[PDB]
């Protein structure tokens, strides 16, 4: 459980990050940035809901959870770290875009994160561009 | 390169058609069509030969 | 003619079973249900693969083993 | 307390009608699970998480009723309340779809999953209302245009459609001023007011 | 996960080891190169990859070649970068064709 817990904080803080940066004083673009994260956190919820389907089938095995939690904890973690830094640096304006492009090249090497940040940066560019 | 690109586009269309046709088969078919082979004859022979190859594969799998 | 031959062969590959903003009222449970169905199909596929591997092993479990 | 019984109570609360094992606490202006509804603390927590829609919806119902209760709101305030009513029709359609699958089912997981977007939309509408309460005429139009700058393209597009619609009264008044020089302002609504 | 399913209600300690034989090989294949790629970076990590580029056991070889073609992207991409941009912005001077600041 402790090994699978790691996405616990990744979601508690992710919900905090999707809340706090929605403020117009946190930026309207950073509000879009939190809304973009909302799409994936919603997918993380949906995957938890479909996990409910297997629990409602009375057919849940701890290995199948971890066998599935492993693929998604990374998807949560990458965005959790990028949001943690996005608020730890208080990034805003083109400096935040700089940090985003940096974290993009820093998550280069994990296509499970590189392509997601490719969409993240694509979405963020809209207000910036 | 024009023939290769045409073959690639045709293969993409056939894969969209869910035909499971090979690129080598595509080139052979291009040669046959330029040679004057009926598309209906080619496709019927292709289906019959695919069935024969499938039957032979099943038989050899039982023949291992 | 090559197109006709390919059309005749069309479907002879396995059939494929699994592969600026909203007006406020454009939010639809259709997309939500589509995503839910996709996730359920993924889970079902995983469970089916597990069950199929299990069946292959269980059929092998009572056999002699030398062929 | 049966989970499906609480589900029915919540299905009523989503329409703003407090449930059987949950009471809309005036101490909270939202649905509070009756402590007599002895279930998992997880279950009560899920009910509390779902009840935010109830609180916001109750606030919205009250506000849209207050805005329609006074004819001094003008055509603009009437349009605000009517757009709220159209959105309420959409939300009621969402609740109806919810009763749709409530037949035969789903779980609290799927409920909250489909309500996460409803919660966000309700939050957007509530932010617009709380940022437009007590504004009138141009003050109401400016209240809308102030919220017309934030991100979140879903809520932003909803607000954009709302603003394009709301300009219809303002646009009509401006077109009257342009073509007829016509200001029929009962309460001097027009920016070009008149001195009788 | 398959193992936990087998634990649900079967196999045997014998059948379990029989169903765990080839995984041992498919794991040891990488376990061998793990200690053989310790601290290897840039050309060091590349050569550690060539330390398995010629190994036998075509199952292990298939794993090695697949993983190697996967990892080649970081380097093949650096190559294409030096082709198009003529650029290798190695903040750690990790580029094989490095530059001098």
UniProtKB/TrEMBL annotation, chain A:
<comment type="similarity">
    <text>Belongs to the TUBGCP family.</text>
</comment>
<comment type="subunit">
    <text>Component of the gamma-tubulin ring complex (gTuRC) consisting of TUBGCP2, TUBGCP3, TUBGCP4, TUBGCP5 and TUBGCP6 and gamma-tubulin TUBG1 or TUBG2. TUBGCP2, TUBGCP3, TUBGCP4, TUBGCP5 and TUBGCP6 assemble in a 5:5:2:1:1 stoichiometry; each is associated with a gamma-tubulin, thereby arranging 14 gamma-tubulins in a helical manner. Gamma-tubulin at the first position is blocked by TUBGCP3 at the last position, allowing 13 protafilaments to grow into a microtubule.</text>
</comment>
<comment type="function">
    <text>Component of the gamma-tubulin ring complex (gTuRC) which mediates microtubule nucleation. The gTuRC regulates the minus-end nucleation of alpha-beta tubulin heterodimers that grow into microtubule protafilaments, a critical step in centrosome duplication and spindle formation. Plays a role in neuronal migration.</text>
</comment>
<protein>
    <recommendedName>
        <fullName>Gamma-tubulin complex component</fullName>
    </recommendedName>
</protein>
Automatic annotation (TrEMBL), chain B:
<protein>
    <submittedName>
        <fullName>Mitotic spindle organizing protein 1</fullName>
    </submittedName>
</protein>
<dbReference type="GO" id="GO:0000931">
    <property type="term" value="C:gamma-tubulin ring complex"/>
</dbReference>
<keyword id="KW-0963">Cytoplasm</keyword>
<dbReference type="GO" id="GO:0033566">
    <property type="term" value="P:gamma-tubulin complex localization"/>
</dbReference>
<dbReference type="GO" id="GO:0005819">
    <property type="term" value="C:spindle"/>
</dbReference>
<keyword id="KW-0206">Cytoskeleton</keyword>
<dbReference type="GO" id="GO:0005813">
    <property type="term" value="C:centrosome"/>
</dbReference>
<comment type="similarity">
    <text>Belongs to the MOZART1 family.</text>
</comment>
TrEMBL record, chain C:
<comment type="similarity">
    <text>Belongs to the TUBGCP family.</text>
</comment>
<comment type="subunit">
    <text>Component of the gamma-tubulin ring complex (gTuRC) consisting of TUBGCP2, TUBGCP3, TUBGCP4, TUBGCP5 and TUBGCP6 and gamma-tubulin TUBG1 or TUBG2. TUBGCP2, TUBGCP3, TUBGCP4, TUBGCP5 and TUBGCP6 assemble in a 5:5:2:1:1 stoichiometry; each is associated with a gamma-tubulin, thereby arranging 14 gamma-tubulins in a helical manner. Gamma-tubulin at the first position is blocked by TUBGCP3 at the last position, allowing 13 protafilaments to grow into a microtubule.</text>
</comment>
<comment type="function">
    <text>Component of the gamma-tubulin ring complex (gTuRC) which mediates microtubule nucleation. The gTuRC regulates the minus-end nucleation of alpha-beta tubulin heterodimers that grow into microtubule protafilaments, a critical step in centrosome duplication and spindle formation.</text>
</comment>
<protein>
    <recommendedName>
        <fullName>Gamma-tubulin complex component 6</fullName>
    </recommendedName>
</protein>
TrEMBL record, chain E:
<protein>
    <submittedName>
        <fullName>Gamma-tubulin complex component 3</fullName>
    </submittedName>
</protein>
<comment type="similarity">
    <text>Belongs to the TUBGCP family.</text>
</comment>
């Amino acid at each position: 459980v402790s090994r699978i817990l790691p996405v616990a904080a990744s979601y508690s803080t992710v919900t905090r990050f999707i809340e706090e940066k929605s403020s117009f004083e946190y930026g309207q673009v950073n509000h879009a940035l939190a809304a973009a994260m909302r799409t994936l956190v919603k997918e993380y919820l949906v995957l938890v809901t479909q996990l409910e389907q297997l629990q409602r089938q009375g057919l849940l095995s701890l290995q199948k959870l971890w066998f599935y939690i492993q693929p998604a904890m990374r998807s949560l973690d990458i965005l959790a770290s990028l949001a943690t830094s996005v608020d730890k640096g208080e990034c805003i304006g083109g400096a935040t875009l700089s940090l985003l492009h940096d974290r993009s090249f820093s998550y280069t090497g994990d296509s499970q994160a590189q392509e997601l940040c490719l969409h993240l940066t694509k979405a963020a560019s809209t207000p910036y561009f | 390169n024009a023939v290769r690109e045409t073959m690639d586009v045709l293969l993409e269309i056939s894969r969209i058609l869910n035909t499971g046709l090979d690129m080598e088969t595509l080139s052979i078919c291009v040669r046959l069509c330029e040679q004057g082979i009926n598309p209906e004859a080619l496709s019927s022979v292709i289906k019959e030969l695919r069935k024969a190859t499938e039957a032979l594969k099943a038989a050899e799998n039982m023949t291992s | 003619s090559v197109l006709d031959l390919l059309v005749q062969l069309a479907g002879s590959g396995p059939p494929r079973v699994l592969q600026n903003v909203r007006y406020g009222g454009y939010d639809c449970c259709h997309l939500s249900g589509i995503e839910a169905d996709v996730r359920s199909i993924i889970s079902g596929e995983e469970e089916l693969c597990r069950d199929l591997i299990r069946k292959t092993l269980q059929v092998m479990e009572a056999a002699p083993g030398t062929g | 307390v049966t989970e499906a019984a609480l589900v029915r109570d919540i299905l009523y609360v989503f329409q703003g009608i407090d449930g059987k094992h949950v009471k809309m606490s005036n101490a909270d202006n939202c649905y509070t699970v009756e402590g007599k509804a002895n279930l998992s603390k997880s279950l009560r927590d899920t009910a509390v998480r779902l009840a935010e829609l109830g609180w916001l919806h109750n606030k919205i119902r009250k506000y849209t009723d207050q805005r329609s209760l006074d004819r001094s709101f003008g055509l603009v305030g009437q349009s605000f309340c009517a757009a709220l009513h159209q959105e309420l029709r959409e939300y009621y359609r969402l609740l109806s779809v919810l009763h749709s699958q409530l037949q035969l089912s789903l779980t609290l997981r799927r409920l909250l999953v489909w309500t996460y977007d409803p919660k966000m939309r309700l939050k957007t509408l509530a932010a617009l209302v709380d940022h437009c309460q007590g504004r009138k005429g141009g003050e109401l139009a400016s209240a809308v245009h102030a919220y017309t700058k934030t991100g979140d393209p879903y809520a932003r597009s909803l607000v954009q459609h709302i603003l394009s619609l709301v300009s219809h009264p303002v646009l009509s008044f401006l077109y009257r001023w342009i073509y007829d020089g016509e200001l029929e302002d009962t309460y001097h609504e027009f920016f070009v007011a008149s001195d009788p």
